[PDB]
Design a protein around this ligand. Structure first.
Ligand code: NI
Ligand code: NI
Lengths: 79, 79
């Protein structure tokens, strides 16, 4: 889009998420948003470690976003 | 508690939910919140219907409330 990776590195994770939602047009679970945001920032999501809580808080405080109910499922064999 | 049912009848659901949380101090699933609110208003869960959606949007927009990622568990028997 309209942001270089340098600009994105300057942004609040919530504003990157807002940009992602605006192009996805669908609900996205938190771990997938972290993966997508990590990839735009040139990192792996575990490297964000420090900014996860600010991010989560902001999603909660900003009324642009809703926490939706849906269940994530996976395979037992993966863990 | 400091509210009569007559006072509760003139509050937004979200304001009742805030008092319940302050009263009980633990996380609640949304349906249980509804269950407890409907009981305090002496109505049946169904009777609210139209206000539920506005209730879930207030919870999202009001910055005092966090949507928690914790998993709700229950018994298959109950359904
Ligand atoms: Ni929110
Ligand atoms: Ni909120």
């Amino acid at each position: 889009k309209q942001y270089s990776q340098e600009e994105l590195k300057e942004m609040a994770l919530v504003e990157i998420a807002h940009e992602l939602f605006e192009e996805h047009k669908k609900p996205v679970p938190f771990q997938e948003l972290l993966n997508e945001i990590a990839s735009l920032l040139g990192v792996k999501k575990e490297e964000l470690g420090d900014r996860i809580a600010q991010f989560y808080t902001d999603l909660n405080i900003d009324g642009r976003f809703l926490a939706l109910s849906d269940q994530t499922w996976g395979l037992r064999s993966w863990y």
